[PDB]
Amino acid sequence: MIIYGVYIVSKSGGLIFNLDNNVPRIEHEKTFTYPLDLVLDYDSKKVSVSFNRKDGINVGHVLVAVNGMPVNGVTLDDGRDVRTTLDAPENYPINLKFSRPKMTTNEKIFLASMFYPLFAIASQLSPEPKSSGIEILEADTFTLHCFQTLTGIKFIIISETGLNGIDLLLRKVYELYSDYVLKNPFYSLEMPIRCELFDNKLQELLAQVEKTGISNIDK
Amino acid sequence: MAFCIAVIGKDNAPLYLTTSDMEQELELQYHVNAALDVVEEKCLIGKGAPESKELYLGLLYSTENHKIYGFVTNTRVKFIVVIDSSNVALRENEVRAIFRNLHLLYTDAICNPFYIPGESLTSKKFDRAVQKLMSGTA
Amino acid sequence: SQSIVALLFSEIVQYSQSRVFTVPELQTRLHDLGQDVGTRIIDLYFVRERSSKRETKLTQMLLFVKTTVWKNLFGKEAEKLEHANDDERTYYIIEKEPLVNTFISVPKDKGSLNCANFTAGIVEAVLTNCGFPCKVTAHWHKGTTYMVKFEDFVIARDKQMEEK
Amino acid sequence: AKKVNSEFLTLTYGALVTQMLRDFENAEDVNKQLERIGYNMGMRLIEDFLARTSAPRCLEMRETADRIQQAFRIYLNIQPTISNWSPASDEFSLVFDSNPLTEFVELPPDLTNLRYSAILSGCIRGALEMVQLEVQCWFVQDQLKGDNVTELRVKFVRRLEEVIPAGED
Amino acid sequence: AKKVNSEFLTLTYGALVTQMLRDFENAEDVNKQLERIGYNMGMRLIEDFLARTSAPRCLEMRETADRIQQAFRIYLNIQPTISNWSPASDEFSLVFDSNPLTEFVELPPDLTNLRYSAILSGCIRGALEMVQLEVQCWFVQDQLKGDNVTELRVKFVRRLEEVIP
Amino acid sequence: MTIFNLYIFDKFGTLLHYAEWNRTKKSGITREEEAKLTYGMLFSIKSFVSKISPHDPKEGFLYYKTNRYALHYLETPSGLKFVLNTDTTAINVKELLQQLYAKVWVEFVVRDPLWTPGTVVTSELFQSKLDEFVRQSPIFGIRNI
Amino acid sequence: SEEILFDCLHAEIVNYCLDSNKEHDLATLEYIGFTTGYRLIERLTREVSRFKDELETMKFICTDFWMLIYKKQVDNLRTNNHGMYVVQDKAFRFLTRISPGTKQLEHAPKFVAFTCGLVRGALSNLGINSTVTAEVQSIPACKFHIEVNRN
Amino acid sequence: MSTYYFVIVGQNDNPIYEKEFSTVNKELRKEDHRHLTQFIAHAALDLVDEHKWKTANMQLKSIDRFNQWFVSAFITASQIRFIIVHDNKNDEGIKNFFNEMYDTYIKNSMNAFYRINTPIKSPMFEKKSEIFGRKYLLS
């Protein structure tokens, strides 16, 4: 039932609200020896690995900290760069932190931006006539459920993949939406909704659904 | 126990080494041993020397200290070893096994793409194949 | 509905936030609206829900008008009443329920004060129309709380009729 | 449950109207101003009435008509009564016997050119526009003007929401 | 009868090698033909190998080694044993006691530079680039050229990536 | 009420073939640009998940759904892509597409000498065999996991 | 599934044909291949005694060789009096993968050479001789038209 | 007969309205009655304020009796001073008459357009008052 994240977007498709329910990325450390079978590749502010995803270090695991010292985009905290640090041998044997890039907020904005067309262009040239767009997009280790307001706003959340009974939960987040837009209808789509009162009401909906009850519509 | 090995083509002989178990065949009948084979195909051939069977020839041809045991394939190849022992305690069963082995070694020399069929057996490998045959069953 | 009133009140606040420039005068405008409400509700409920009989004495009228107004407004009387010795003029009436949160509330950066003052305005109307001119402040202390500064002639008057 | 008393909503509406009469001298301005605030009401009223019930979008006008009468009976607790269709069935009339907003208030004779309860027409407008649906609504008869009961018009000139929820935007 | 259904293949291969070798005098020219023809063949074969073994895709050279030696098991009925890893895990070695595709093709043809397993090298590379793995391939040891074990070598050169959507 | 259609795309993103049975919404776009659009969209979704994944997406994308039809996706590690349209609700079809790949395509395409690599298949046997393998279970509906 | 190698390899041979000769394909494939099959044919129905010569219709031996390689049986076997004759086969494996529509006909001589180039026997119709032309009208239906090396 | 005089006083002591029913004659002297009893209402107010601080009764039937001018007080929750002044007594009429005055006053006080302490010109209220006077005072 655990929800990885919750989201809502506007007629613009802009990400209006992106509360995340605290789902951390995996981490790995191991006392690295002479040049590592991890195939380290520099790609544009990413210091990652392209191959040999061993020991639970995925390919996408971006270098996060070096020898305890943090590493920043391409170089490190102290001014050393990943390349100079790495290819110098006698530093080894050493520890390297690695994990996946928690996409900084702006990147999440970009992600929602690029996704919106897929919603609006979910093969509008469908087989089935006078069709309707996307609503449910299952994926590897998450599943996306969206609730169109049937006119206007989109309601997408990110849940545990193997689950049902979430579209009613979307209806209830729609109810929370109504509750908040009662606040100031001038406080409209144009500005994003960051009003901590409604937001902790949402996190209480989260609190209820973390516990067993998703039956017992109580929010 | 001289096994004058002799594969024959359609008519001519691709490989006919002169070897046995111990060392080379001194006796100077070689070219005229092939002539023994030719007098085979002159009088002993009958209507029989070529057949369409994996050919058991228990002594198609015999003489003193020299006993020919034959074999023929559908490809008209003549396979012949000679029992050059007036008698030794070896019975035709291992001779059949030997023509099995010789069949297989010859046809695995045949397995070469480079070696054109009907030519002198170049393979020192098929050599050592025949050589182990002789060193074993002579 | 609940939510229709919340919406109409959001349009209240927004109309103020439009043709009002700064926050304290916006609270003043809310207070004016509250006076408008009280000015007629008190005379209404003299009869129907207040035993049809007038009541003059201070604390009794305070508490009973509190309750009757809340029953015919939301049906929920204020949760407690404090009257403070250290300033006999200083009384506090405190209700954990804000009228505002029918729509859950405003930005928490620009406007420290909210509808709390508009309810305080209705309070001021009823007090001053009963015979109790007073100034009321809304504070975000222990939830929606209020404080009342009665009238001096009134404060002497009841201080005198503390006996009969 | 609505958890609130009809008179309190009426007093808030009277506070608005009186405050408009004060702040702005003319009835036409205060009326257009309130119609704007009601337009902005509708942008939340219609989504609420959808959160209470995901009604069908539209196959016909009277389907929207009884949807909105349902909504009117929801928040105002008062059952309306649709009537007076077009020959083309496109436009209808809406009946309120007594609006908590409209009632408990009569009008000083100076304000005849004022259309008082027009906040509802604004509500309908904005409600139909957030639902991407183009309609014209004005109170052809109002309880205050001497009309028996408030009567509206609902002129659905054209469409803005398509059959697929992609729509034009 | 029928110990080996496809002993036919090795004789066909011997025919092709001698046909080219007659056509093109140089061992080098036929080396390129063998490499490219292995390329096309491995492109044909990798999709079937992934229809049967139904591998996810290779993101790690230990996985690549297991996959390809499994393909050898299932295609040429041979059991290459992975060995001699790179410190960087790029190189590994495939131990063929009997190159299956040769049964005394010729031990001396009097021709060094004529490498037989180039067909395998082409197949392995073309297969790999179907699955987005540009790895070079060569042969550290080869029985025919005088060795006792024929040993293919591959070293991870580059991780190809799909681009241009 | 058989399947709507079925798509193929190489690891270079080129439409190999499109077979239609029951698609009805008559396309305003000529099919080739549509196939390009769909391949780009699917690539976008791959990037979409590969960024916003909580953990390793081992097989990544699976499929998407509408209220009134549905679609499913299959990924081939060589980079070929499989897409078909189905109804919303019946047994899963991820396995059915795996089977169609491992049998029909690997047989009646790559084992065809007269299909040059990386082009449009135009085999009447591959066409008719696709027709029959679809006619195997002309089942419409997915509810895929 | 060992066939896939040979299907692909013969396919790529169908691909490249350099203009010097049509069929650069020499028959050593055929020669060494029948010798191999006959290593597996270490027994065929010919009597133990050498004189009584029985000939095995290479038609039948062709049936068996297909079962050893082509795996599917030769069907319609029409034969003139002398060494000239033919096989009519409804299905041919390499042309099973091509569209049955009679549109791709040229690819046969690579097919028909493979049934040539098998050493002869002295007694005719003994089972091994080969010199063969093909006339594939329908795609799956190869038509290997036989001509003995003799008359 | 009895003379008839009603007065309405705002919180800020504003005389909101006054109503008459007496048989019409010597209108100047009836205006003299009006101002006579309005200043009487001022003094009677200065009295009835502490009188209401004493008793929160429904209605203060008597506040002063000028021996020809009679002061009857029905003060409201909003402290709206109401007085009937008459040369003759009729208690039963006046008690529920001030009651019904208060009632129709509530009715016409609800309208948002009225603001505290403001004269109200609604002739509907005039005829409501007249009907009450014909009911509880006049015959």
mmCIF file of N, CA, C and O in Angstrom, chain H residues 62-103:
data_model
loop_
_atom_site.group_PDB
_atom_site.id
_atom_site.type_symbol
_atom_site.label_atom_id
_atom_site.label_comp_id
_atom_site.label_asym_id
_atom_site.label_seq_id
_atom_site.Cartn_x
_atom_site.Cartn_y
_atom_site.Cartn_z
ATOM 1 N N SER H 62 -44.395 51.192 33.332
ATOM 2 C CA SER H 62 -44.473 52.568 33.785
ATOM 3 C C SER H 62 -43.086 53.032 34.170
ATOM 4 O O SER H 62 -42.390 52.351 34.928
ATOM 5 N N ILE H 63 -42.685 54.182 33.641
ATOM 6 C CA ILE H 63 -41.429 54.821 34.010
ATOM 7 C C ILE H 63 -41.671 56.173 34.662
ATOM 8 O O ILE H 63 -41.082 56.491 35.700
ATOM 9 N N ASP H 64 -42.544 56.978 34.076
ATOM 10 C CA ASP H 64 -42.997 58.182 34.747
ATOM 11 C C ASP H 64 -44.469 58.365 34.433
ATOM 12 O O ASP H 64 -44.963 57.905 33.401
ATOM 13 N N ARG H 65 -45.168 59.022 35.346
ATOM 14 C CA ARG H 65 -46.562 59.384 35.146
ATOM 15 C C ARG H 65 -46.693 60.862 35.477
ATOM 16 O O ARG H 65 -46.791 61.235 36.648
ATOM 17 N N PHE H 66 -46.688 61.699 34.443
ATOM 18 C CA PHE H 66 -46.752 63.150 34.596
ATOM 19 C C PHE H 66 -48.066 63.634 35.057
ATOM 20 O O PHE H 66 -48.247 64.859 34.983
ATOM 21 N N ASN H 67 -48.949 62.723 35.465
ATOM 22 C CA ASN H 67 -50.281 63.035 35.972
ATOM 23 C C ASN H 67 -51.214 63.449 34.838
ATOM 24 O O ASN H 67 -52.428 63.558 35.034
ATOM 25 N N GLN H 68 -50.654 63.693 33.653
ATOM 26 C CA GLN H 68 -51.423 63.689 32.412
ATOM 27 C C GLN H 68 -50.679 63.053 31.250
ATOM 28 O O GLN H 68 -51.319 62.717 30.250
ATOM 29 N N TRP H 69 -49.364 62.864 31.344
ATOM 30 C CA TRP H 69 -48.565 62.189 30.331
ATOM 31 C C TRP H 69 -47.967 60.929 30.939
ATOM 32 O O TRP H 69 -47.373 60.981 32.021
ATOM 33 N N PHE H 70 -48.131 59.803 30.255
ATOM 34 C CA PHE H 70 -47.848 58.497 30.833
ATOM 35 C C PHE H 70 -46.726 57.822 30.054
ATOM 36 O O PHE H 70 -46.753 57.788 28.819
ATOM 37 N N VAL H 71 -45.747 57.282 30.773
ATOM 38 C CA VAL H 71 -44.513 56.779 30.182
ATOM 39 C C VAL H 71 -44.512 55.261 30.290
ATOM 40 O O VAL H 71 -44.369 54.707 31.386
ATOM 41 N N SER H 72 -44.626 54.587 29.152
ATOM 42 C CA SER H 72 -44.582 53.133 29.085
ATOM 43 C C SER H 72 -43.402 52.701 28.229
ATOM 44 O O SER H 72 -43.290 53.112 27.071
ATOM 45 N N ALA H 73 -42.552 51.845 28.780
ATOM 46 C CA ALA H 73 -41.268 51.528 28.176
ATOM 47 C C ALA H 73 -41.176 50.052 27.818
ATOM 48 O O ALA H 73 -41.378 49.185 28.671
ATOM 49 N N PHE H 74 -40.847 49.779 26.557
ATOM 50 C CA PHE H 74 -40.470 48.451 26.083
ATOM 51 C C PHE H 74 -39.104 48.581 25.422
ATOM 52 O O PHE H 74 -39.002 48.876 24.231
ATOM 53 N N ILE H 75 -38.063 48.363 26.199
ATOM 54 C CA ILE H 75 -36.701 48.464 25.699
ATOM 55 C C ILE H 75 -36.270 47.122 25.121
ATOM 56 O O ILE H 75 -36.655 46.055 25.607
ATOM 57 N N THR H 76 -35.464 47.179 24.068
ATOM 58 C CA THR H 76 -35.086 46.025 23.267
ATOM 59 C C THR H 76 -33.713 45.510 23.667
ATOM 60 O O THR H 76 -32.987 46.132 24.443
ATOM 61 N N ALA H 77 -33.354 44.362 23.091
ATOM 62 C CA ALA H 77 -32.022 43.818 23.312
ATOM 63 C C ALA H 77 -30.956 44.767 22.788
ATOM 64 O O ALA H 77 -29.922 44.975 23.433
ATOM 65 N N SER H 78 -31.200 45.364 21.630
ATOM 66 C CA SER H 78 -30.322 46.394 21.107
ATOM 67 C C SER H 78 -30.554 47.737 21.767
ATOM 68 O O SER H 78 -30.174 48.767 21.202
ATOM 69 N N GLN H 79 -31.186 47.744 22.938
ATOM 70 C CA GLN H 79 -31.445 48.945 23.716
ATOM 71 C C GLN H 79 -32.266 49.971 22.959
ATOM 72 O O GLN H 79 -32.156 51.169 23.237
ATOM 73 N N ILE H 80 -33.090 49.552 22.008
ATOM 74 C CA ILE H 80 -33.880 50.530 21.276
ATOM 75 C C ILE H 80 -34.996 51.020 22.184
ATOM 76 O O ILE H 80 -35.904 50.262 22.542
ATOM 77 N N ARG H 81 -34.914 52.282 22.591
ATOM 78 C CA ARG H 81 -35.901 52.857 23.496
ATOM 79 C C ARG H 81 -37.232 53.017 22.777
ATOM 80 O O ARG H 81 -37.303 53.639 21.713
ATOM 81 N N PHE H 82 -38.277 52.444 23.353
ATOM 82 C CA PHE H 82 -39.629 52.576 22.843
ATOM 83 C C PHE H 82 -40.531 53.096 23.946
ATOM 84 O O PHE H 82 -40.472 52.610 25.081
ATOM 85 N N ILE H 83 -41.351 54.087 23.620
ATOM 86 C CA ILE H 83 -42.272 54.675 24.578
ATOM 87 C C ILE H 83 -43.599 54.949 23.901
ATOM 88 O O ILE H 83 -43.640 55.465 22.779
ATOM 89 N N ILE H 84 -44.676 54.600 24.584
ATOM 90 C CA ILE H 84 -46.009 55.071 24.265
ATOM 91 C C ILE H 84 -46.387 56.097 25.316
ATOM 92 O O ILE H 84 -46.235 55.852 26.519
ATOM 93 N N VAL H 85 -46.856 57.254 24.873
ATOM 94 C CA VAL H 85 -47.289 58.306 25.775
ATOM 95 C C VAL H 85 -48.741 58.634 25.473
ATOM 96 O O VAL H 85 -49.105 58.873 24.317
ATOM 97 N N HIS H 86 -49.565 58.640 26.514
ATOM 98 C CA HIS H 86 -51.000 58.769 26.340
ATOM 99 C C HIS H 86 -51.591 59.481 27.543
ATOM 100 O O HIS H 86 -51.070 59.392 28.657
ATOM 101 N N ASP H 87 -52.702 60.171 27.307
ATOM 102 C CA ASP H 87 -53.429 60.827 28.380
ATOM 103 C C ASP H 87 -54.309 59.857 29.154
ATOM 104 O O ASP H 87 -54.851 60.228 30.200
ATOM 105 N N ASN H 88 -54.451 58.626 28.670
ATOM 106 C CA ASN H 88 -55.296 57.608 29.276
ATOM 107 C C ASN H 88 -54.560 56.276 29.275
ATOM 108 O O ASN H 88 -53.714 56.029 28.414
ATOM 109 N N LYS H 89 -54.887 55.421 30.242
ATOM 110 C CA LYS H 89 -54.245 54.118 30.368
ATOM 111 C C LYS H 89 -55.010 53.045 29.605
ATOM 112 O O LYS H 89 -56.245 53.038 29.601
ATOM 113 N N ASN H 90 -54.276 52.138 28.952
ATOM 114 C CA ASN H 90 -54.848 50.884 28.449
ATOM 115 C C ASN H 90 -53.724 49.845 28.445
ATOM 116 O O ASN H 90 -53.049 49.651 27.432
ATOM 117 N N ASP H 91 -53.567 49.143 29.572
ATOM 118 C CA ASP H 91 -52.402 48.280 29.757
ATOM 119 C C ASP H 91 -52.423 47.089 28.810
ATOM 120 O O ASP H 91 -51.396 46.752 28.209
ATOM 121 N N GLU H 92 -53.574 46.422 28.687
ATOM 122 C CA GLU H 92 -53.638 45.207 27.880
ATOM 123 C C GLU H 92 -53.318 45.503 26.423
ATOM 124 O O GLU H 92 -52.633 44.718 25.757
ATOM 125 N N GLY H 93 -53.802 46.634 25.911
ATOM 126 C CA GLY H 93 -53.433 47.023 24.566
ATOM 127 C C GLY H 93 -51.947 47.269 24.446
ATOM 128 O O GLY H 93 -51.291 46.761 23.541
ATOM 129 N N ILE H 94 -51.388 48.010 25.395
ATOM 130 C CA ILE H 94 -50.024 48.490 25.238
ATOM 131 C C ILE H 94 -49.010 47.360 25.381
ATOM 132 O O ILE H 94 -47.993 47.345 24.688
ATOM 133 N N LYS H 95 -49.251 46.405 26.278
ATOM 134 C CA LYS H 95 -48.243 45.374 26.511
ATOM 135 C C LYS H 95 -47.977 44.570 25.241
ATOM 136 O O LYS H 95 -46.884 44.629 24.661
ATOM 137 N N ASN H 96 -48.977 43.833 24.769
ATOM 138 C CA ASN H 96 -48.768 43.103 23.533
ATOM 139 C C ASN H 96 -48.722 44.022 22.324
ATOM 140 O O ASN H 96 -48.300 43.580 21.256
ATOM 141 N N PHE H 97 -49.092 45.295 22.465
ATOM 142 C CA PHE H 97 -48.889 46.222 21.366
ATOM 143 C C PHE H 97 -47.416 46.524 21.179
ATOM 144 O O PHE H 97 -46.914 46.520 20.059
ATOM 145 N N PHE H 98 -46.716 46.831 22.264
ATOM 146 C CA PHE H 98 -45.267 46.920 22.193
ATOM 147 C C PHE H 98 -44.668 45.595 21.788
ATOM 148 O O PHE H 98 -43.636 45.562 21.112
ATOM 149 N N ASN H 99 -45.308 44.492 22.168
ATOM 150 C CA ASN H 99 -44.863 43.198 21.667
ATOM 151 C C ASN H 99 -44.880 43.172 20.144
ATOM 152 O O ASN H 99 -43.855 42.928 19.505
ATOM 153 N N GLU H 100 -46.022 43.473 19.546
ATOM 154 C CA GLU H 100 -46.166 43.364 18.102
ATOM 155 C C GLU H 100 -45.379 44.445 17.367
ATOM 156 O O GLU H 100 -44.880 44.208 16.262
ATOM 157 N N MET H 101 -45.266 45.633 17.960
ATOM 158 C CA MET H 101 -44.275 46.602 17.511
ATOM 159 C C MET H 101 -42.899 45.975 17.422
ATOM 160 O O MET H 101 -42.225 46.079 16.395
ATOM 161 N N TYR H 102 -42.465 45.320 18.496
ATOM 162 C CA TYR H 102 -41.152 44.699 18.499
ATOM 163 C C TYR H 102 -41.058 43.649 17.411
ATOM 164 O O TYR H 102 -40.013 43.483 16.778
ATOM 165 N N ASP H 103 -42.152 42.938 17.177
ATOM 166 C CA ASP H 103 -42.131 41.860 16.201
ATOM 167 C C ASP H 103 -41.936 42.404 14.792
ATOM 168 O O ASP H 103 -40.982 42.040 14.089
#
